[PDB]
Amino acid sequence: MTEYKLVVVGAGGVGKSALTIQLIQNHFVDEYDPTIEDSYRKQVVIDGETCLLDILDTAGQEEYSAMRDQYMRTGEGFLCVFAINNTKSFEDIHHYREQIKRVKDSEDVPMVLVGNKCDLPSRTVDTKQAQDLARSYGIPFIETSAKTRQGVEDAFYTLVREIRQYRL
Ligand SMILES: Nc1nc2c(ncn2[C@@H]2O[C@H](COP(=O)(O)OP(=O)(O)O)[C@@H](O)[C@H]2O)c(=O)[nH]1
Ligand SMILES: [Mg+2]
């Protein structure tokens, strides 16, 4: 049974928990404690392949978690999330990518840049800025809305496709 272990990272408030809950449970949760870190597993079909997703929704807290360490060590791909109406969260992306590179001791880790909250009209990070950053890292950029589901499967499934390419 094919399995893909994914990790969702990025600044507090960008929609990591809402994106993960949307993917797994097909609804938008508008309040979810920003300190809760949990994993979610689901059987899905991606490009006709039945597979298991095993996703860590990180929360950036200081307390030790053996599970968190395990997902960093064995996680196969990472979503790096910012919000398109939060310039600071976009400025914070580079730090998350640098951490992931250190965990893997590698420049080539399957990764997707995710610009969430694209349903909102107050866009302060434009598509070109994000596309240029993604191009600099050599990774895809996907715009998402956890509220409407726009791009949500694309973001996670694109990550799965990046993993598939890496495995070859
Ligand atoms: N409009 C909008 N609000 C969102 C979206 N995703 C998350 N939110 C809201 O943004 C806030 C932070 O979301 P949350 O999932 O807790 O973010 P996390 O701290 O990254 O886990 C909450 O108020 C969510 O309701 C989205 O796509 N659109
Ligand atoms: Mg959260």
Numbering used by the authors: 1 to 168
Publication excerpt:
Overall, the structure of KRAS4a-R151G is more similar to WT KRAS4b than to WT KRAS4a, in both the crystal and solution states, despite the fact that WT KRAS4a and the R151G mutant differ only at that single position, whereas KRAS4a-R151G and WT KRAS4b still differ at five other positions in helix α5. Last, we analyzed the impact of the R151G mutation on the surface electrostatics of KRAS4a. The absence of a long positively charged side chain in KRAS4a-R151G results in the exposure of a contiguous patch of negative (red) electrostatic potential. This surface closely resembles that of WT KRAS4b, which has a native glycine at position 151.
KRAS, the most frequently mutated oncogene in human cancer, produces two isoforms, KRAS4a and KRAS4b, through alternative splicing. These isoforms differ in exon 4, which encodes the final 15 residues of the G-domain and hypervariable regions (HVRs), vital for trafficking and membrane localization.
